Amino acid sequence: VNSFSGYLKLTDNVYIKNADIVEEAKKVKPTVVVNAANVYLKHGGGVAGALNKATNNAMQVESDDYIATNGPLKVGGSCVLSGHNLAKHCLHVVGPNVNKGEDIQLLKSAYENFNQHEVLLAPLLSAGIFGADPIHSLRVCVDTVRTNVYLAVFDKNLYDKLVSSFL
Numbered sequence: 001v002n003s004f005s006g007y008l009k010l011t012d013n014v015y016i017k018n019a020d021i022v023e024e025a026k027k028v029k030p031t032v033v034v035n036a037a038n039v040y041l042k043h044g045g046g047v048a049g050a051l052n053k054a055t056n057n058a059m060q061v062e063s064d065d066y067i068a069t070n071g072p073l074k075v076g077g078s079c080v081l082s083g084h085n086l087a088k089h090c091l092h093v094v095g096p097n098v099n100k101g102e103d104i105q106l107l108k109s110a111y112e113n114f115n116q117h118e119v120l121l122a123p124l125l126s127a128g129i130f131g132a133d134p135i136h137s138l139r140v141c142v143d144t145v146r147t148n149v150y151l152a153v154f155d156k157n158l159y160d161k162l163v164s165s166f167l
């Protein structure tokens, strides 16, 4: 038993809710919150901008030090950093940005990072401002992640579409 509440069980291991991931994180304080990161960990907008704002920019400060030491992530890759006031850890995961021509097949690689964590709160990777169809992102998630994932979808109209088209 865990502290997540109000989710639709899509499968044995995937759950979904209409909520802002930032508010879910503040309420639950999960072990792992997933950020929809870019390779430079420049958290300007979308999920990343919202999470970073909620940390009062501490996420960005930590991220800039990470990049200065290690260089950029790979598309499809990830790193574990602090979750600051939102979670124990933040798993920064880079899904492909189809607006930049990046291979949508890399979305499966991106979701594979989730399997290194038993339970995660997460957004739909590559969707939103990253340009991919959220319906596709949800399907890849279900077909790739085997650990317990709680997906927060802020857009209510999209949530309804994701639910209705699922089975």
Ligand SMILES: CCc1c[nH]c2ncnc(NN3C(=O)CC[C@@H]3C)c12
Residues within 6 Å of the ligand: 019, 020, 021, 022, 036, 046, 047, 050, 123, 124, 125, 127, 128, 129, 134, 152, 153, 154, 155, 158
């Ligand atoms: C609007 C930005 C945002 C803030 N907090 C969020 N929490 C969850 N998802 C979010 N955005 N997204 C959707 O709602 C559908 C896919 C895309 C990632 C957000």
Ligand SMILES: [Cl-]
Residues within 6 Å of the ligand: 045, 046, 047, 127, 128, 129, 130
């Ligand atoms: Cl977004």
